[PDB]
């Protein structure tokens, strides 16, 4: 099996999960099926990925075939920032829950802190492709999301792409009902997030590492961009353990008690990515890997950088 990180709610969040961004229809269903078979219990989803209906199919299949029980699955989705207006929070969540064919979510995340123009255009933008903002804020969103927890439709709330300033704004809001259980952010040896992980952990907030393999198929990749999978120094450590680069990149987070959600639709890779509980990176190897920090992001979202709550201006 695979280990977990205990949340502030005492719920157990499986430390490896399956990413689903850009997992195509026609592949994502088989991907979820192979992952469950391979021992994955945590699946990371989102409204904006537009494939929740197929993830839902796969989960239902495995449950009705007795491969797994709902209570042993840990399903996460995210509210997109075109839906921060209160009534849209409900409508957006209802579509996610119905697509996923579930009666509750384990975690529901604010996907990004900056609000976008409210509505069903997911990427409202000007002529240059710059995001158009909305006046509803992540605090408005959180307020409405808290009702879902009151109603037992979501077990816990969290945030994604929040800086420590934005988490402080959240924690320090008077009249807060629920606290975020996780902050899902990009994290890997080129962006080690030392200060942000230290902050979150000090507040009882776990970290979920996204793009842990450096998202090698991001359509905006430039050949001069760094490549973690092909990095000779990462590959050196892999070799030392007779493991793959990807397995080292995943194990890196487990050893920092950080949840990690590599994405694949390739059955061999889905299996490979969870074969990370039979080796250990040594203290010196962990130190070497941490030294690779470049403060480099695969996910800059520069087209939203002019917005008030754009998260990446702050140091952490
Ligand atoms: N909250 C956010 O704003 C946010 C942002 C980014 C990502 N995420 C979440 O985090 C998940 C993971 O991040 P990501 O999808 O950006 O990138 P990633 O997991 O770092 O990398 C995925 C890419 O690596 C390939 N791959 C997977 N396993 C491999 C292996 N063992 N060896 C070689 N290549 C491998 C995949 O190919 P194949 O699929 O073709 O096998 C895919 O092209 C996302 O899917 C999403 O769930 C969240
Ligand atoms: O959940 C997300 C995701 F998985 C992404 F890859 C992106 C994403 C991103 F943050 C970026 F910065 C990109 O340049 C990109 F192409 C993306 F797909 C994103 F915005 C998300 F909200």
The C-alpha atoms of residue 237 and residue 245 are separated, in whole angstroms, by 8
220 ligand 2 Cβ < 6 A: yes
**CA-CA distance, 197 to 185, in Å (whole number)?**
10
What phi-psi label fits residue 140: left (phi over 0), alpha (psi between -120 and 50 degrees) or beta? alpha
DSSP state of 71: G
Nearest C-alpha neighbor of 75 from the set 37, 49, 113, 101: 101
Helix 245-254 vs helix 283-290: angle between axes, to the nearest 10 degrees? 100
Residue 231, token pair as written in the block: 């990095």
Q: Say if residue 38 is exposed, middle or buried (CB neighbours under 10 Å; 0-12, 13-18, 19+).
A: middle
CA 107 – CA 145 distance, rounded (Å): 11
- CA–centroid distance for 262 within its chain: 9
Q: Phi first, then psi: give them for residue 249, nearest 5 degrees.
A: -65, -35
Rg of the Cα trace of the chain?
A: 19
Q: What is the 3-state secondary structure (H, E, C) of 119-136?
A: CCCCCCECCCCCECECCC
Q: In this structure, what token pair is assigned to residue 23?
A: 């997992």
Is beta strand 206-210 parallel, antiparallel or unpaired with respect to 74-79? unpaired
Kind plus residue range of the DSSP H or E element containing 107: strand 105-110
Contact 71, 42 (CB under 8 A): no
In testing the pocket of ligand 1, which one of 79, 210, 258, 312 has its CB within 8 Å of the most ligand atoms? Answer: 210
Resolution in A: 1.8
Going from the C-alpha of 52 to that of each of 12, 85, 191, 276, the distances in angstroms are: 23, 22, 29, 27
Around Cβ 165, how many Cβ atoms within 10 Å? 16
Domains and CATH numbers, the chain: 1-316 (3.20.20.100)
The Cα 2–Cα 258 span in angstroms is 13
Experimental determination approach used: X-ray
- Measured in angstroms, how far is the CA atom of residue 218 from the centroid of ligand 1? 9
> Known binding site: residues?
20-22, 44, 111, 160-161, 184, 210-217, 261-273
3-state secondary structure of 302: helix
Ligand 2 pocket mutation pick from 299, 304, 311 by most atoms within 8 angstroms of CB: 299
């Amino acid at each position: 099996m695979a280990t977990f990180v205990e949340l502030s709610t005492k719920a157990k969040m499986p430390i490896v999960g399956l990413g689903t961004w850009k997992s195509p229809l026609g592949k994502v269903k088989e991907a979820v099926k192979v992952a469950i078979d391979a021992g994955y219990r945590h699946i990371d989803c989102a409204y904006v990925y537009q494939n929740e209906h197929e993830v839902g199919e796969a989960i239902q299949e495995k449950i009705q075939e007795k491969a797994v029980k709902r209570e042993d699955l840990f399903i996460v989705s995210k509210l997109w920032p075109t839906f921060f207006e209160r009534p849209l929070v409900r409508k957006a969540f209802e579509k996610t829950l119905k697509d996923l064919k579930l009666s509750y979510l384990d975690v529901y995340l604010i996907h990004w802190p900056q609000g976008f123009k409210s509505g069903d255009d997911l990427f409202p933008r000007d002529d240059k492709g710059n995001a158009i903002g909305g006046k509803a804020t992540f605090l408005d969103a959180w307020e409405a999301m808290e009702e879902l927890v009151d109603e037992g439709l979501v077990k816990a709330l969290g945030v994604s792409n929040f800086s420590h300033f934005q988490i402080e704004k959240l924690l320090n809001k008077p009249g807060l009902k629920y606290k975020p259980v996780t902050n899902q952010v990009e994290c890997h040896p080129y962006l080690t997030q030392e200060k942000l992980i230290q902050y979150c952990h000090s507040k009882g907030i776990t970290v979920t590492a996204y793009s842990p393999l450096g998202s090698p198929d991001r359509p905006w990749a430039k050949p001069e961009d760094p490549s973690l999978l092909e990095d000779p120094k990462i590959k050196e450590i892999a070799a030392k353990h007779k493991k793959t680069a990807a397995q080292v990149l995943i194990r890196f987070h487990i050893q920092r008690n950080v949840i990690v959600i590599p994405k694949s639709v390739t059955p061999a890779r889905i299996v490979e990515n969870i074969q990370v509980f039979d080796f250990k990176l040594s203290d010196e190897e962990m130190a070497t890997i941490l030294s690779f920090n470049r403060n480099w992001r695969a996910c800059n979202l520069l087209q939203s950088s002019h917005l008030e709550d754009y998260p990446f201006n702050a140091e952490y």
